[PDB]
């Protein structure tokens, strides 16, 4: 409540609203608590220092806004809300739980208010097309990443990306966090769901450039000491913002954990910068200090100036799969994956995105058939399937219902106890690849043969 | 008409060639019969009778494969049809073994070289197969090395003339002919997910309905030549005799064109004319008539099919036999050969022409060389055991 | 004695496995019976108990 | 009437494709060219639809959209992976007369890469391949010519070689890789020079096989 009290100083609109918004926040929390604990996930843990990061994230987007509508508060107040709680949340009940126990608690606290504006589906917010972080319709932002995207194949690195909601909001929820000093990311999803390449995307959009290593065999600690200094100069000393990407492979090994996790805790590492190393980094972060503006002389400031350069300028973006026990392990070896990294969650690519990923994908198909006759009955896999549907719809949600079904065999094989491979988006990208080759050669052999 | 269904059977083998890579041949069975009850209940054209391994592959492949020792069954052929047909790098899965030699004997001709995770080499090799083109076959997965990530992921970068891929910390190029097959040895083994997004499986691990499928189709060839040539028949009613009617129409169209006005002349093209219409008409002949030969071959399949039966059961049991003694252990091979000189080679059988005598005589003697060759490789112990096993074996096959 | 050393007898398998025998050629290896006895070479081999 | 209109608007799009058309290959930027051609596309999108009832106004815009499709062939065309003896094998196979200062962008374009697509990427997949190939043998060429022995000082009496288990290791995989690109389906072009490094490595592998009993005996027996 104070703290609240010193951050709508900046609205006077807005005084008496503070003690509402306090007692809602705390509520929720309180909920939020109580109803996710550890024993469902390893990860379902609250805390204050989430709804300080709650009130420090409203003060930012208030900031700015030089007023706004109570409407305008409870719809910021609900985004940071979604983004701080709903985002690490696993399984789809939960999130639709959380989704309208928001909308529940604010409409408690917070009478005589339009819902609508208030609170919508889509409660997006970006700085991207305006100066300040105003919520934008999604339409607009779409059409905005989708040039951006197509920058983005011309420069860096040409990955084809479709572009439905989920990679949508996916984008915002990185963009914010990259923004952000000691802003290191975490990402739970299946293979292929993107995790690299939105990443990436939102990395090149940043202006941040992108550092991976290459784990292998014979991979020895020496190497990842090697790259960690060399990442470590680039940040710090040339001010040059890095977005550090690990996946699982190289999180295997249990030496890489510990240096990473003082990295991410302090922002350095001691030990990694020893003898004449100490002396190069030295020497160059002089001339980075005084290249910046500042000048320091002894060693420790020396030293102060570098670990602040790498807090404001290394973001490291953690990727892996949603392995519940094995995240166990990885809180169990590194606390820093769950105290200061930010996670996300979206291993689940929806039927909706399996929609419109096969949609897009076979573009170039002819499927079109004057002739075909909607059936009375269909197995709609995809509700919000448009109807009569023409082909091309019926054969994309012919796809959705095979990559369910392979979904539907691989659960039940794990219930007899037989192995299970998981199926991943990959699969499914394969699967509407080789349709096109194989659709394409098959006209091409009739065509000829006609 | 074949037009208004491209789109069915191309999604079917498409969804089959991507999907049920790991699975069994029941497995995908079953997920084919789903899919396909999906499309017809959509009301998408597809045909009723997609020979998976018809229509991704025509006879000459698969005569190249069988030249190549592949075994001539409907699990291997459709295993290597996905070895023919994939986006991503196969993985294999054969504890038998056969698949690897396969997949040398067909890229011989490439020069194809064989490597395991474990040697200490494998990298130097890769770099090799990488940067000069031959296809490289890498076994022992299970120590599966993550720089093959990249080469696995396919992300290339075109700097200057430069094809590169940053295999580690070099940067070495890559040459168009390069192709990789992952193998594996052990049937029981976990993948890490990524690396499972990464490829794309094959399995060739023998089952019950696997093995049972294979028995009864070698029985049909051994004892009756005429209903397995008659389903071999129907196996190429759809392509391959229609290729055949194409490439003879072709030789028509060559042989009239040839004629500078003999096609009065000499009056003989009509009789390659008539060739033509007499092969047109058997085909024709053979299309009518297929829901008789799918009823009368399925009759004879089930006269059989108690003993396809009982030669799984008591292979599986001869795999089982390695939990009493650690000697004990039997391969696929092994039984085969025992199954081959039960079939023939057999002195009971010679002088027999009824055709339920001879399968009664050819279940009795199967149980007979089996204990016959197992014991031989067993304590004293331990052959009432495996008496009592085949005994039960018998009691679950007999009827009555 | 192949039984004394098992590398050996791995070796010995890889070897057999590719290799084309003279049509009357026979590779008998007289053994003690031992669980040091690689897998593979059971696998391959006709076993005989005495 | 019409048609000289729609004559006069299609010339300033004829007059700028014969101005792309007259730039020397040397000199044309792929990434430039699409941009530009996209700008053409537009322009012409651009005209009235009385215009673009006619055969001519449909013909140019197949017509670019046909550079456009072959913009890619052009991407790898212009890859320095191209070298002399695959232009002269790019000569045979089109029939053609292209000199190799007057090689242009108008030349190409009137060539059908709509048609014979197949056969450049056949060519430009060999060219890969030889370049690949080749590169190896500037790496090999490099590192045998960069490569020092390490010497260091033994009791004051010399300076004894050292990192024999490096050296050696270096020459076995250089030996492997040799005998490796041997099997090489593009073997062929590079086959002297691979007679030749073969040559160098093997005496190479014999000399410091021979040197490193020398060294150890003489250090044993100077003991
Ligand atoms: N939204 C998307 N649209 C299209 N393709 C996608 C999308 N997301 C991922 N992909 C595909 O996934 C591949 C890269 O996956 P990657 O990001 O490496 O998986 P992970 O997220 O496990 O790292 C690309 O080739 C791309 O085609």
Redesign the pocket.
Known sequence: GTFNRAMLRLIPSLRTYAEPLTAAMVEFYTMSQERFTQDTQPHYIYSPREMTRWVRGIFEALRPLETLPVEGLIRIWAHEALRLFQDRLVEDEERRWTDENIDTVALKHFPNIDREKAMSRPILYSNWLSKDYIPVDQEELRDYVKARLKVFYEEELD??????NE?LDHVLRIDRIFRQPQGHLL?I????????????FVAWMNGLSVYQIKVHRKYTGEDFDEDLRTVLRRSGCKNEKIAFIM?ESNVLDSGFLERMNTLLANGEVPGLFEGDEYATLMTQCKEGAQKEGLMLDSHEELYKWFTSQVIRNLHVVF?M?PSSEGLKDRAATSPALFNRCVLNWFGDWSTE?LYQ?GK??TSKMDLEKPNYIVPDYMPVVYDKLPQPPSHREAIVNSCVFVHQTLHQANARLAKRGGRTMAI???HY?DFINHYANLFHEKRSELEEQQ | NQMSTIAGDCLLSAAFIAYAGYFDQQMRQNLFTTWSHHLQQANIQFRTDIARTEYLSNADERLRWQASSLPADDLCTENAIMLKRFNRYPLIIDPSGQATEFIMNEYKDRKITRTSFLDDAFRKNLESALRFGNPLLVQDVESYDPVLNPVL?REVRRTGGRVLITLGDQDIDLSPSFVIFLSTRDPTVEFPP?LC?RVTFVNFTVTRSSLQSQCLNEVLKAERPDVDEKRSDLLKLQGEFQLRLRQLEKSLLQALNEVKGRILDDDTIITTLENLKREAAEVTRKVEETDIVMQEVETVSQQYLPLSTACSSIYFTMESLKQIHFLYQYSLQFFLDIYHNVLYENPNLKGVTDHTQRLSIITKDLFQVAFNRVARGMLHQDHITFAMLLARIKLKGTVG | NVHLAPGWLMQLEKKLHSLQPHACFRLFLTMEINPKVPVNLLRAGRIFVF | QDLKGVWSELSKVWEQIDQMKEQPWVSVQPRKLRQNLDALLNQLKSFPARLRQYASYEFVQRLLKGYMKINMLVIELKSEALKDRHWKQLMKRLHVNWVVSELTLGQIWDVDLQKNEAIVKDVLLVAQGEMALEEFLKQIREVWNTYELDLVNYQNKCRLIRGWDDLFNKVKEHINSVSAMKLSPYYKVFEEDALSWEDKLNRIMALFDVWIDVQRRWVYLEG
């Open positions: 990955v084809p990306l479709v572009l439905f990679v990402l999803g299946v293979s292929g769901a993107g995790k690299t390449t939105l990443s990436r996946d990727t799969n995105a990923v897009e994908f991943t988006p990959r990208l | 992921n990524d997004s």
